[PDB]
Amino acid sequence: QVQLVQSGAEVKKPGESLKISCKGSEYSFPNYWIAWVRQMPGKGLEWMGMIYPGDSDTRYSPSFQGQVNISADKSSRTAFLEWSSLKASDSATYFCARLGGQLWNSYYYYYYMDVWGKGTTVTVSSGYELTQPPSASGTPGQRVTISCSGSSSNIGGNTVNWYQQVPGTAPRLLIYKNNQRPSGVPDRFSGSKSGTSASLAISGLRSEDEADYYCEAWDGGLRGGVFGGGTKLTVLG
């Protein structure tokens, strides 16, 4: 099975350099974009940038460009994220993720992150987002909708994806291209988009649905993905 293998946890002091890695296995490594995503402790997902390993084409979020370096070694099927000088504020979990669209297949290309690495935690110490409600809750069976509000440059002109993240684990693609479900995602999950807003509906909650949910869309002005702040879903009981 396809996987992205990330390097182990790091504990560093402010000022030190660090390079972390993400090795792609069981697919054609040169032919898919790989994204890096930051999650500060207790916070949401942030798009850092992405690289196309075939030619090392790198596209950064303006929030991260000049602060980190993304690179790739085709021969070892590995992508990297590197800092020359860490700050305490760099403490976070870093995920790599494959963009699952097939660029060569002749169909219009949509951005979505289909396979995620397990994350690498980095602890450094010396001793714009889409709008989502921060929480949702219901008893088992409760119909719950989670909203995502954006603007013309993202949701208005681009497709929306949804990711589910159970604490301590990697996000999982739930809905892509507004309303399409990957195999394995149950039919109680559905997505819709209208104007500059999008919605994830859970027709009736199950206990295993307790998780954080993130919407995401490409922003044409920023030339990268933008995540919503996340909705923590509690199932009451």
Author numbering: 1 to 127, 143 to 252
Give excerpts from the publication.
A type I hypersensitivity response is initiated when allergen-specific IgE bound to high-affinity IgE receptors (FcεRI) on the surface of effector cells, such as mast cells and basophils, are cross-linked by allergen. We present four novel Bet v 1-specific IgE, for one of which we solve the structure, all with their genetic origin in the IGHV5 germline gene, and demonstrate that they target two non-overlapping epitopes on the surface of Bet v 1, thereby fulfilling the basic criteria for FcεRI cross-linkage.
The crystal structure of the M0418 scFv was determined to 1.3Å resolution. The structures of the two independent molecules of the asymmetric unit were similar and were superposed with an RMSD value of 0.56Å over 232 Cα atoms. The most significant difference between the two molecules was disorder of a stretch of residues from CDRH3 of molecule B (residues 110-112.3), while that from molecule A was completely modelled. In molecule A, CDRH3 extends ˜8Å above the surface of the scFv. The order/disorder observed for CDRH3 in the two molecules can be attributed to differences in crystal packing. Nevertheless, the structure of the unbound IgE scFv M0418 demonstrates that a human allergen-specific antigen binding site may display a protruding CDRH3, similar to human antibodies of other isotypes 60–62. The more narrowly defined epitope of IgE-derived clones M0418 and B14 (residues I56 to K65) encompasses the loop connecting β-strands 3 and 4 of Bet v 1, and belongs to a conformationally flexible region of the allergen 49. Notably, the critical importance of residue F62 in this interaction explains the inability of M0418 to bind Bet v 1.0112, an isoform that carries a single modification (F62L) in relation to Bet v 1.0101.
